[PDB]
Design a protein around this ligand. Structure first.
Ligand SMILES: *[C@@](C)(CO)[C@](*)(O)[C@H](CC(C)C)NC(=O)[C@H](Cc1ccccc1)NC(=O)[C@H](CC(C)C)NC(=O)[C@H](CCc1ccccc1)NC(=O)CN1CCOCC1
Ligand SMILES: *[C@@](C)(CO)[C@](*)(O)[C@H](CC(C)C)NC(=O)[C@H](Cc1ccccc1)NC(=O)[C@H](CC(C)C)NC(=O)[C@H](CCc1ccccc1)NC(=O)CN1CCOCC1
Ligand SMILES: *[C@@](C)(CO)[C@](*)(O)[C@H](CC(C)C)NC(=O)[C@H](Cc1ccccc1)NC(=O)[C@H](CC(C)C)NC(=O)[C@H](CCc1ccccc1)NC(=O)CN1CCOCC1
Ligand SMILES: [Cl-]
Ligand SMILES: [Cl-]
Ligand SMILES: [Mg+2]
Ligand SMILES: [Mg+2]
Ligand SMILES: [Mg+2]
Ligand SMILES: [Mg+2]
Lengths: 196, 204, 218, 222, 222, 195, 233, 196, 195
């Protein structure tokens, strides 16, 4: 996997590749790693496909029950539920999750949750095996309060490089845009991003 | 220390024209040491026949268990259990011990009393059903039995002919296996009569 | 690969020379590879060797032994002693000790100066002179029949039967022993072959005539 | 095993080979790997044979009770959810690799499930030891907007690739077609391209060949 | 860690008649669950009316055959073009195999031909050089399936004369070349059904005083 | 780890059990009785893991004696052997199994027949004319296979047994310090003091 | 005893009526890292042979040097080095197979899988495989690594047996190879889009094609795929 | 380690960090990983300090003996000698070396030699533990026929990022410039490169 | 494996060695002589790894006999023991060491004194009044420590030895099939046939 989430002026954008592997075999070349846990709280999944699915399903259940009782949960609240599961079951899980959401008060927020189950709030986050190859690129090119089009290009160029160098990453580049306007899904195919 | 090959033994079952046959060797050993030449591996509950290979303690235990369950079945149902139903019972019972299984290779054989159709089936140690038109094999000489049955078998054999085919399949398979032999028994099963024959074989 | 196979071999000294008796079965695990294996190696017309452990190791080096014995008598103009022949083999396998040879054999011969002589030779270097030896997976079964019925003043006929009956006892009980029985009688003038005997037919024949094996239905 | 699933215009089709192994030995030359969970939800199974049958029957039972309780026809996502949560709980120890497909009031669906509890969505899928051979065919010949007849052809061709090129797969091709608004049609032995040739000789023995020690009549009656 | 051995599957079969001998083998070559070749011969004419096959690890098998063929060539040079008898070839092969006793050729070797009396001869070897002459011998993956069938049909084991109370055995007799080929074909079609590593094709080499003839038959390709 | 033998003859069952108890390089005792009377006409000998053997034998003994008091009736050897087998069959899949092998010699008073049962630690039961556990069978079975006749007397059975012990004393590596012999017949259980 | 470091993935090949085709991608992987992108894994020997190599790249470069030296050595004291006594595919293969088996027998293998494709002097097609174990086999289609699992099934649909070779043209055979390379790009995690392809024909000789790309790919259907089961958005 | 070599218009420039580690302890913070094997043929050393020193010393000996007999060796020749040592002793070595040199005919050339002992001629090369984090950055920013000042900035920014993310890289950035003009040594300190 | 004992008394050295040769679960022989005469007044007993024992003993025997012929002179027990020690000391750092333990009993004709040397497979030499190898010492030393006197006769030494063999036969786990006893004195080497 190569995944990332980036905050910008109008909100936040999640990005991911579409590759799922069993050793060197690609079990799924059109995987959707960007998954909804609430209307405007999404997550990027990396690590075990089984573990990350089971976790995301439980979080979605918790946030649905939260909403019925206490109204719309914060992005911080969603990250806390993820953390609780990842931390308390650290011995039996292999899950690297990035939580991203849009509030009206707090605007775009990004929380990353590595293997151990720690939580880290950041302006942007990268994760997955392919992220290693773009730490330098992302650090040099990230700016706060970017526009939607700038942020889309940043994610596109970043994941393009991650895919190029990482054998465990590839396929299409999926993106999910979270703003006050609503939820927008984007997709970018090899013929476009490879020749960037 | 491989539970399925400590005691040794084999079972084979075949279908014919309006009949079925099931046969087994009589050996029970402790690895190289032969201990008993009277250890029969075929049991019956009413008109349904069950052969069991593998670890002898589990063979004995399962027979006692299926006797238990078929006796209660008959008391409540007020009728004898049929082969197709018994096959499912065996499968359920084995899978119940999925993560601590009985080390066995059971084989069901019998004729349905209502339809008159010949029926055989085989299982793995955790209860997977292997249904077959022709034949089923089990035991430490299963490879040998597969080879004999696949070449010797033909469909719609008469009881007297079927007897010779299953007997020859068992005998020659058992002689190419160290842990099988020391005697043999063959059940010929017709709709309303059952003949049991002990075979003469080499005792080494 | 699998060199560790089962067997029952014996050889004993008596008034009329030496009896050698072996089974014929070869196994690769539970699979019976052969029922017609020659486990007595005819080193030369006067010397015999038994096969137990590695089949190849026994065949190769006891044939090699026959070559050394032929060279000895060409140079010394005299028959080689059983002591000297056995020691050539034991010294050889001792050089290979640790490498992984697998061997348990009885070197049998009858000469003027020695008389009937048997040496147990083994792949870890052991060389023992003795009157009775039994080797293989079924050696214990054969020893029981031998010990209880053995006497020095046995006749040639009775001694041949004893060796045949002892192998049968092992063939019956030991799963890795059986097939057929090969008999040999070693005299001062050379060894004499006393035929191949199928255990299947031999068992039923002995059961009826002897009254033994009542535990078995026949 | 080789198993596949292919979506088409008005539904979905799944297929499977019929070989059952026990080491290098073929235990069953004509076993059924297509399972019915509900009337219009079917499942192709690879991996541990007992596990695929057991897990599919358990979920099938609970799906039936659920359908009766809710007075509704069962949904594929319910079977999917119940299967994956069961498999996840056992941490891969239940070796069931499934292709779940069917039609329900929501529409037509095609999923795969792996032993550890992960699921995937797709228009064409393949599982089992011969999945690479089958997937090679699917990647070569699949297109959008397949008809019923085209999907059956593609699915069976994918299974054939497994039959011929994978030693784990063989014998016949089973198919099940689930079309919207119609009954699901289970096509047992849809293709049989591995018929055994006539033997050179009959091995029927002369009667009395086998030596016999004892005879006795067995009492099966009360 | 590097493992210098592999398993290329396949099975071979040698039968000896009165004035002839056959050495058969399937033409399939495999690694794990993949097919490498559907037609890769492993039964060879080595000259002097000797046919040879070394089944198991194909690299060791080809090396052995290649060394034996070379041994035959030098036997002619060193001993005035003398014909290498089958028994002499057998002893020579023992020394080839045992020469690598502590790093063995991972193969089961079978040779066939005619002895010095003109009678059919088959010799079989273990991986380290123990050998034996036999009427009948199967080797390789499906040896366990084929061999007990041969015992029953060639050597008439467990078959007694009808009506004789199992007292009189069925008498041994030489089979014709036609009857032997029937048994070979039926042996391989049965092994093909039940063993995954056996199939594709069957190549038989027949040896008579006239020379070495070949016959080929198709097998199931699944 | 030792020698327990059993021979069923015409009118009785004879059990022979080694007297040695060894721990490390020391023979701690040379007069150990490796048997328990389960009922007046049923005797059980045992061999296996230290501690487990006696603990198991006495547990069985207690259960059979409890049955006898409750019903005022003696269980048949077949019934006792089946009970013993089931206990071992339970044991083998426990957290810590009983590593005990047993022979059960009994005289059935209803059938007027002697009966010998061999049960290993896995719960593997067989009825036999003669039986053994451990390596003992590897030596004696060929002798019994040969000399054993089904119509033998008790005295003939004792001579056949002596022959077995002699072969064991000749060919076995370990010194097992002789055997205690006990006879089970219609009149109950008694010990042969001079063997 | 070795472990491979920089590796090359599948090599695929097949026979057609007048010759043979062979292909392999231009990637040198360093574990999961796709480190080197300009790696040629098809190496021509003369004008009638092409050796396709997968596995360890350092060992591949060693074999390149051996083949190059073989051509030099064959030209020594050989007036017919460019005619009757030129190097044949069968000569080149047997040399490599000898080396591979000798190296495995010294427990120090060349960690490679090799396919030698070419045309003999009499016009016969040559196609044979050899690997680190010294194992050799020939077939109308041959492939290494993932190619064995995914390419062979596709190529065997064209040429399923010997009798299908005269019926298969160079246009059809090349099409199947190019299709197979696309499937490998879809499904092999250590593959690249860029590859090389070589044709050895008995009439038109050796044609070596560099800098080919996988094209006409299907990715559009990906947009319709949402979630992993229940998700609708 | 983080090391790289980059060809440009006038020749080639080698670049490296100065960190040497024993576990997490920095045994030397001012290491010189850029080493001379000939007047205008240098190498970047990564992997085992002992192995790479022993190899470089042998190569320097071979090239000195080559020069006495046959005159100035090519950069390709130098890379071949390195390869021969690394390939034939692959079982006992842990050395990732980049060879860089300046000819008058061939101009600037760069050869990289990974663990296995393979040789790869490239326009530019990166190696060492810290190189993983700048594959994306270097691929996006490298251009052929750059100027001296552009190439110095490229290496400086690249190794700056590699040092920032890699714990096994740090200290000063050493550089060696190889042109027709001669040999120039450069050094850049933390206070400069960290705040890039 | 097993029992080699040695006792030095006033005027002689007595060596006792077990007769059993065991391989697996079978006693192959019960009359094995685990000793070689190195010279007319020097005897060596041995125990250890199978094959190595006899191969080593005979190799030493050959070397000492060679010396005797060359010099027409018998080497002293001390000289022979030192030679034997050095050979074992070389062996222990070889590719495959001799796993053999020995006792060397000899009568020095120049000193008119009996001498007993104990040498283990490492090449560890000690001169002792009484000695043993293996587990044998664990049983007998306390007995010898108590009953042994330095001025004993040969007959008194044989009785002391009988007492040791009795304790071994009582407490040792394995049956070693008795011992062959040999005496070394001024008149040379002789065997006690009835023990
Ligand atoms: C990139 C690939 C790596 O960062 C991404 O992180 C993606 C994340 C997506 C899918 C959400 N990760 C994967 O694709 C993931 C890689 C992986 C593998 C193993 C452990 C952790 C991560 N792949 C999987 O989870 C696959 C998905 C299947 C094919 C649908 N599952 C496996 O590979 C299973 C997992 C078993 C397991 C191992 C350890 C911890 C948890 C689960 N493994 C196998 O099936 C083993 N396989 C059997 C055949 O022999 C080769 C090995
Ligand atoms: C293709 C054909 C192969 O991958 C398919 O995937 C099919 C799937 C269909 C049948 C549903 N798979 C099999 O046929 C499967 C392959 C397999 C084997 C072993 C483990 C996993 C998968 N075969 C089986 O499951 C057989 C079914 C028999 C033929 C009825 N079962 C066995 O081989 C069992 C394995 C049982 C098991 C227990 C615990 C964990 C995993 C599996 N093995 C035996 O019976 C072997 N042995 C015989 C002697 O008695 C002791 C057990
Ligand atoms: C960066 C750091 C990584 O890419 C660079 O590659 C530099 C290269 C420069 C120095 C040319 N590499 C190192 O600094 C290198 C890291 C390393 C360590 C071990 C194996 C390979 C690479 N460090 C070293 O070589 C140090 C140098 C010493 C401190 C002067 N040496 C060690 O760490 C030694 C090496 C022993 C060794 C192991 C395996 C292969 C070859 C050599 N290791 C120790 O001293 C072990 N140490 C003992 C105390 O307990 C902790 C471990
Ligand atoms: Cl997923
Ligand atoms: Cl340094
Ligand atoms: Mg990629
Ligand atoms: Mg048998
Ligand atoms: Mg037997
Ligand atoms: Mg097949």
């Amino acid at each position: 996997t190569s995944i990332m989430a980036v905050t910008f002026k109008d909100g936040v954008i999640l990005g991911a590749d579409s590759r799922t592997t069993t050793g060197a075999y690609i079990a799924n070349r059109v995987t959707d790693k960007l998954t909804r846990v609430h209307d405007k709280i999404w997550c990027c999944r990396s690590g075990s496909a089984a573990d990350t699915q089971a976790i995301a399903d439980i979080v979605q259940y918790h946030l649905e029950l939260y909403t019925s009782q206490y109204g719309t949960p914060s992005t911080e609240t969603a990250a806390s539920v993820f953390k609780e599961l990842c931390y308390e079951n650290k011995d039996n899980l292999t899950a690297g999750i990035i939580v991203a959401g849009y509030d009206d008060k707090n605007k775009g927020e990004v929380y990353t949750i590595p293997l151990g189950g720690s939580v880290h709030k950041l302006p942007y986050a990268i994760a997955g095996s392919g992220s290693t190859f773009i730490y330098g690129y992302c650090d040099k090119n990230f700016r706060e309060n970017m526009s939607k089009e700038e942020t889309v290009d940043f994610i596109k160029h970043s994941l393009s490089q991650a895919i190029k160098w990482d054998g465990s990453s590839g396929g299409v580049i999926r993106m999910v845009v979270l703003t006050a306007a609503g939820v927008e899904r984007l997709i970018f195919y090899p013929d476009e991003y490879e020749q960037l | 220390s491989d539970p399925s090959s400590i005691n040794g033994g084999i079972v084979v079952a075949m279908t014919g024209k309006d009949c079925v046959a099931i046969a087994c060797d009589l050996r029970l050993g402790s690895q190289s040491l032969g201990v008993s030449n009277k250890f029969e591996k075929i049991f019956h509950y009413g008109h349904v026949f069950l052969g069991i290979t593998g670890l002898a303690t589990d063979v004995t235990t399962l027979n006692e268990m299926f006797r238990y369950k078929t006796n209660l079945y008959k008391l409540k149902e007020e009728r004898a259990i049929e082969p197709e139903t018994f096959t499912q019972l065996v499968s359920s019972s084995l899978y119940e011990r999925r993560f601590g299984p009985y080390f066995v290779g059971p084989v069901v054989a019998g004729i349905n009393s209502k339809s008159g159709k010949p029926f055989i089936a085989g299982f793995d140690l955790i209860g997977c059903i292997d249904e077959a038109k022709d034949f089923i094999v089990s035991g430490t000489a299963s490879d040998q039995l597969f080879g004999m049955c696949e070449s010797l078998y033909e469909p719609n054999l008469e009881p007297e002919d079927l007897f010779e085919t299953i007997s020859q399949a068992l005998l020659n398979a058992a002689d190419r296996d160290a842990l099988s032999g020391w005697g043999a028994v063959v059940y010929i099963i017709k709709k309303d009569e059952v003949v049991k024959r002990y075979l003469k074989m080499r005792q080494d | 690969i699998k060199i560790a196979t089962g067997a029952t071999t014996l050889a004993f000294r008596f008034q009329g020379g030496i009896i050698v008796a072996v089974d014929s079965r070869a196994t690769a695990g539970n699979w019976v590879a052969s029922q017609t294996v020659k486990k007595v190696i005819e080193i030369n017309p006067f010397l015999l060797g038994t096969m137990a452990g590695g089949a190849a190791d026994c065949q190769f080096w006891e044939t090699w032994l026959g070559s050394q014995c032929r060279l000895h008598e060409l140079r010394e103009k005299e028959r080689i002693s059983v002591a000297a022949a056995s020691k050539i083999l034991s010294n050889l396998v001792y050089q290979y000790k640790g490498a992984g040879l697998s061997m348990g054999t009885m070197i049998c011969g009858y000469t003027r100066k020695e008389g009937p002589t048997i040496y147990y030779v083994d792949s870890d270097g052991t060389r023992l002179k003795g009157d009775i030896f039994c080797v293989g997976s079924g050696q214990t079964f054969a020893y029981g029949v031998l010990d209880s019925n053995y006497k020095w003043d046995l006749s040639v006929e009775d001694a041949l039967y004893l060796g045949k009956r002892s192998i049968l006892a092992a063939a019956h009980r030991d799963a890795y022993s059986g097939g057929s029985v090969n008999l040999y009688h070693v005299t001062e003038d050379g060894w004499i072959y006393h035929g191949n005997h199928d255990v299947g037919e031999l068992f039923w024949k002995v059961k009826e005539e002897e009254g033994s094996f009542n535990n078995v239905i026949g | 095993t080789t198993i596949v699933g292919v979506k088409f215009n008005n539904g979905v089709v799944i297929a499977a080979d019929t070989r059952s192994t026990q080491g290098p030995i073929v235990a069953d030359k004509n076993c059924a790997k297509l399972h019915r969970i509900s009337p219009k939800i079917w499942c192709a199974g690879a991996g541990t044979a007992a596990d695929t049958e057991a897990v599919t029957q358990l979920i099938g039972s609970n799906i039936e009770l659920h359908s009766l309780y809710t007075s509704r026809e069962p949904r594929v996502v319910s079977a999917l959810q119940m299967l994956k949560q069961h498999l996840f709980k056992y941490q891969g120890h239940i070796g069931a690799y499934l292709i779940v497909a069917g039609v329900d009031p929501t529409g037509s669906h095609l999923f795969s499930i792996h032993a550890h509890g992960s699921t995937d969505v797709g228009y064409y899928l393949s599982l089992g030891s011969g999945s690479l051979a089958a997937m090679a065919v699917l990647e070569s010949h699949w297109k959008q907007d397949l008809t019923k007849e085209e999907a059956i052809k593609l699915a069976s061709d994918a299974i054939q690739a497994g039959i011929w090129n994978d030693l784990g797969s063989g014998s016949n091709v089973d198919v099940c077609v689930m079309e919207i608004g119609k009954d699901a049609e289970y096509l047992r032995n849809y293709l049989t391209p591995n018929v055994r040739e006539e033997k050179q000789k009959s091995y029927k023995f002369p009667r009395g060949t086998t030596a016999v020690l004892k005879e006795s009549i067995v009492n099966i009656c009360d | 860690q590097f493992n210098p051995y592999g398993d290329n599957g396949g099975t071979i079969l040698g039968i000896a008649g009165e004035d002839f001998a056959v050495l058969a083998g399937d033409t399939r070559n495999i690694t794990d669950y993949s097919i490498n070749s559907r037609y890769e011969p492993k039964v060879f004419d080595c000259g002097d009316n000797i046919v040879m096959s070394a089944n198991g690890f194909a690299a060791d098998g080809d090396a052995l055959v290649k060394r034996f063929k070379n041994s035959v060539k030098w036997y002619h040079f060193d001993h005035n073009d003398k014909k290498l008898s089958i028994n002499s070839a057998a002893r020579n092969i023992q020394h080839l195999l045992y020469g690598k006793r502590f790093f063995p050729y991972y193969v089961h070797t079978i040779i066939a031909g005619l002895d010095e009396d003109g009678k059919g001869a088959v010799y079989s070897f273990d991986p380290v050089g123990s050998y034996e002459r036999e009427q009948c011998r199967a080797g390789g993956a499906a040896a366990s399936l084929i061999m007990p069938f041969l015992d029953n049909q060639v050597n008439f084991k467990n078959q007694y004369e009808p009506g004789t109370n199992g007292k009189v055995k069925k008498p041994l007799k030489y089979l014709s070349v036609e009857e032997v080929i029937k048994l070979v074909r039926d042996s391989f079609t049965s092994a093909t059904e039940r063993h995954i590593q056996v199939g594709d094709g069957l190549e038989i080499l027949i040896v008579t005083k006239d020379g070495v003839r070949k016959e080929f038959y198709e097998l199931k390709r699944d | 780890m030792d020698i327990i033998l059993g021979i069923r003859v015409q009118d009785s069952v004879i059990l022979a059990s080694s007297k040695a108890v060894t721990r490390g390089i020391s023979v701690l005792k040379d007069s150990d009785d490796k048997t328990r009377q389960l009922s007046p006409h049923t005797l059980m000998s045992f061999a296996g893991e230290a501690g487990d053997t006696v603990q198991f034998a006495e547990y069985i003994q207690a259960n059979i004696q409890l049955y006898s008091i409750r019903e005022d009736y003696e269980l048949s050897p077949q019934a006792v052997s089946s009970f013993v087998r089931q206990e071992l069959a339970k044991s083998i899949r426990s957290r810590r199994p009983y590593q005990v092998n047993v022979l059960i010699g009994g005289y059935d008073k209803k059938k007027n027949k002697p009966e010998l049962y061999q049960i290993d630690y896995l719960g593997t039961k067989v009825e036999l004319p003669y039986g053994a556990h451990g390596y003992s069978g590897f030596y004696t079975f060929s002798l019994l296979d040969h000399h054993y006749r089904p119509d033998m007397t008790t005295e003939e059975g004792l001579d056949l047994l002596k022959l077995c012990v002699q072969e064991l004393e000749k060919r076995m590596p370990m010194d097992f310090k002789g055997v205690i012999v006990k006879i089970v017949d219609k009149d109950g259980i008694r010990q042969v003091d001079d063997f | 005893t070795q472990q491979p470091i920089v590796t090359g993935t599948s090599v695929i090949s097949m026979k057609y009526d007048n010759g043979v085709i062979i292909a392999a991608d231009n990637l040198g992987s360093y574990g999961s890292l796709l480190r080197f992108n300009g790696v040629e894994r098809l190496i021509p020997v003369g004008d009638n042979t092409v050796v396709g190599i997968s596995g360890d790249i350092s060992d591949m470069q060693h074999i390149e040097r051996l083949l190059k030296d073989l051509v030099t050595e064959n030209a020594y004291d050989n007036p017919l080095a460019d005619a009757e006594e030129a190097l044949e595919p069968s000569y080149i293969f047997e040399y490599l197979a000898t080396v591979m088996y000798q190296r495995r027998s010294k427990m120090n293998p060349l960690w490679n899988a090799i396919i030698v494709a070419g045309v003999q002097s009499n016009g016969d097609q040559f196609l044979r495989y050899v690997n680190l174990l010294g194992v050799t086999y020939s077939s109308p289609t041959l492939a290494t690594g993932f190619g064995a699992h995914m390419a062979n099934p596709l190529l065997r649909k064209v040429v399923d047996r010997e009798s299908d070779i005269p019926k298969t043209t160079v246009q059809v055979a090349e099409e199947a190879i190019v299709n197979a390379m696309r499937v490998l790009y879809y499904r092999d995690a250590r593959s690249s889009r860029n590859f090389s392809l070589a044709i050895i024909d008995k009439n038109t000789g050796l044609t070596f094609k560099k800098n080919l790309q996988v094209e006409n790919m299907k990715w559009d259907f990906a947009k319709d795929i949402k979630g992993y089961g229940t998700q609708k958005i």
